[PDB]
């Protein structure tokens, strides 16, 4: 079923579940909007994400 | 601030810097962030293959 | 979606022409207007799609 | 209209016909329509299914 | 999603009021606060009944 459907997929679709692995590397643009924002957000998951 | 321009249609996000200095209208798109990552192209690796 | 982020125009301390720009801009959003125009640049190739 | 309130707080989505009426603020909260159904319960419960 | 429409707060025309919340939602919004404040009223009460 697997080989006939092939239901390929990232195990990653969330920001946490992004946060959660560390073998595919993150970033987004520097000095942009989007960091600066990472910037004080201090959520539970984000603040690793900024680290 | 000047007047020079008085309108400023543009992708300007509405922040609470801009907003200090310059009124803004209401949004005619709200953005957020989000992931982006490669379409999945999904490969079996050996142990977790069979 | 992570944010929620707006754009717009920008103006000075109570324009007058913000407060009819605005209101414009909320017939067309509720006419389906900016919609159509929103996936006109976006879509140029579609979803070439075999499987 | 009347101004027994100077600020009219409450979940209400900003529209064409309020706003020339009487001002809102930012959206605070910007959303939509959607359209919402049950969960797929598949048959996969059952120690007989084999 | 199906609309694009998001809440506001009714304000007085002249209302010197909008402004200044205004600049005081963009400051909730820029510190994060905003995401918890929905979560606890949207996701906090279904900690439990979460699947």
């Keep these: 079923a697997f080989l006939t459907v092939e239901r390929m997929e990232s195990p990653i679709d969330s920001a946490d579940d992004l946060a959660k692995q560390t073998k595919i590397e993150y970033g987004a643009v520097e000095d942009g909007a989007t960091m600066t924002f990472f910037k004080k957000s201090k959520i539970s998951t984000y603040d690793k994400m900024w680290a | 601030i ?8 543009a992708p300007l996000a509405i922040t609470y810097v801009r907003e ?5 209208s209401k949004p005619f798109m709200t953005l957020g962030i989000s992931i982006l990552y490669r379409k999945p192209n999904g490969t079996n690796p050996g142990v977790f293959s069979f | 979606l992570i944010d929620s982020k707006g754009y717009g125009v920008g103006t000075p301390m109570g324009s007058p022409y913000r407060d009819k ?19 006109k640049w976006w879509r140029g190739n579609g979803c070439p799609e075999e499987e």
């Design chain 2, 20 to 24: 200090k200095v310059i009124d803004f």
């Design chain 2, 2 to 9: 000047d007047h020079k321009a008085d309108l400023a249609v």
């Design chain 3, 21 to 39: 720009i605005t209101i414009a801009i909320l017939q067309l959003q509720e006419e389906g207007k900016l919609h159509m125009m929103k996936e």
